[PDB]
Structure formats: C-alpha cells, structure tokens
C-alpha cells in the first residue's frame, strides 16, 4: 500500500532532480525510513521531493529537524538526490520482496 506508493513516487520522480543540492549517503538496514528522512530534510527549495518527504514522515513520525541528527551515523559520502533516490529505490524494492 503506502510502501508501493512510496516506490511509485520515487520512480515517478526519476523519469535533473534538486539541481545543485547534495545529500548524505544512507546506510540502508533496519527499516531506516528515519535515515532516509534525515538525509532529505537538508534539501531546500525542491518541490519534486516534498511528497517523498511527507511519505517518509508517514513511516517515521518522530521529530526530525534540518541540521540535527539522531538516526544518521554514516556521514561521509555526499551524492545527487537522483543517485540517493536510486539507492533508496534498490533497498525499498528488496524489502517489498
């Protein structure tokens, strides 16, 4: 349901994305919807990712603020939002199976 919709949205948006805006690479493990949400929350002025952020906020209802981290521990590799969505898309389709 919401998980298919989240995958649908990520494919829907990868058909550039947040041009000039880099996000942190996410360690995709134990239902890390919070880690994905923490990585994207630092993107400013991008209408294209709003739905994904709201959808992710549905799965992770905890307080998540821009700049402040709790879920994220692996802060080293910085990527394009397109690359991040493609990395999130690989993990999300693995959980769906």
């Amino acid at each position, epitope marked *: 349901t*919401a998980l298919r919709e989240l995958i649908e949205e990520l494919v829907n948006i990868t058909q550039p994305l*947040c*041009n*000039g*805006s880099m996000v942190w690479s996410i360690n995709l493990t134990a239902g890390m919807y919070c880690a994905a949400l923490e990585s*994207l*929350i*630092n*993107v*400013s*002025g*991008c*209408s*294209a990712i*709003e739905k994904t*952020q*709201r*959808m992710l*906020s*549905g799965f992770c*209802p905890h*307080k998540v*603020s*821009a700049g402040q981290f709790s879920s994220l521990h692996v802060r080293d590799t910085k990527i394009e939002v397109a690359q991040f969505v493609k990395d999130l898309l690989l993990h999300l389709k693995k959980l769906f199976r």
Partner: antibody
Amino acid sequence: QVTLRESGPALVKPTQTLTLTCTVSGFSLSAYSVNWIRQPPGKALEWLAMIWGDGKIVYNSALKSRLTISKDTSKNQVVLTMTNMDPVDTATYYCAGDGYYPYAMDNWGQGSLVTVSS
Amino acid sequence: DIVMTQSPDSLSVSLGERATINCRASKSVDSYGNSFMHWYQQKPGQPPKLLIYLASNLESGVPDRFSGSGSGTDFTLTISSLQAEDVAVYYCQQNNEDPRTFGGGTKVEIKR
C-alpha cells in the same frame, strides 16, 4: 544569513500593472522558494503566489488570472506582476522564503506598501 | 481551496495567565499522519514571524511558553503565561494543499 527585500512603486494608478521585486541574498534561488503575501491596512494576511527553487509556480485561486510570478537566478530576484490594480488592492506586499521541510514561511521581508490611487 | 477560520477574533488575558487561540480548516490539513499547518505572530508594524510548524513544533529561538496542538481540521496555539511583549495578531496557515491559505487572525491583548 538569508535576507529578503521588496522593491516597487509606492503608488500605482487604478487599472495599471503593479511590478514588485524581491531581492534575495545569502541563498541561491536555484534552491530557495519565495512567496508573496499581502496585507490590506488593518486586515488579514492573504497568500498570493510562490515559486519553488526548482521552478514550480502556485497562485492564489481568486487572483490567478491577474498574477504572474517569475525569477532571474542571475540577479537573485523574484518578480510579481499584478494587472488591473484597484483601490481594494492597496496593501503591504511581503515576500517570504520557505524554510526546510515541512516548508513553513520562516523568513520575511519588511514589506512594501503599495497604494492604488489616481 | 482550504479555508482557515480562527476563533475568537480577539482575546484579553492578565499578565502571567494562560492564553488559548483556535483554528479550524475547511478540509483536512493532514497528509500521512502529520498536520501541515503553521502558526505566526505579527506585532504592530512588523512582518509576521513563524512560531510553530507542523502544528506542534517550536521554531528555533521562540520562547517555550508557546505550544501548538491539534489534528486534521481543529488546531490550537497556547501561551502558558502571557507576557506584555506577546501582544500581537496570531495567524494560522496551511500548506497541505495548494494554494497556501492563512486564517483571519486573532488579536491578543493584556488585561491590566
């Protein structure tokens, strides 16, 4: 250190077009969303339009046919035009930037009062 | 087109007393269990200032006496101990659905 500053005429003749400019400093318009809001003296705030950093344009529904929002990333300015100005459009016009997700309007300009009169 | 309606239109409370403001949306401002509604304070001759976002989160630097609550259609802004500097007009606003809309405002005054 993000700042927004509105500029435009203090006075517009009835039926004429108002052109307002919002100059943004400290944030690139390629990743910064700018809103226009107005406030008639002693009345409620009225949201008018916005242009996201990635280009999405949204307008107030009742004033849609009269409004055009645009931007020039080079001069780092957002322009609002409103046609067929009437004395009822006399108001302080504010531009305001969105914060991060959930995208509330966290950064406001001082506002520019526009009077519509002959 | 989500219409935001505030009640009461104005209110007068003693210094150090609890103050409560209400806001009602015409449609739900919820998306995936979160409320896309925000509260602003506007002091005379100044632009509005964000106080609360996502219905209950305090904007950084805003005094802790302010709080927000509610879900779906009904929202509340609360000042635990009204201060002389809290005199202003308070506005609610939604961004759940385009276009963004503001409430009509509520003027808060001190009873002295």
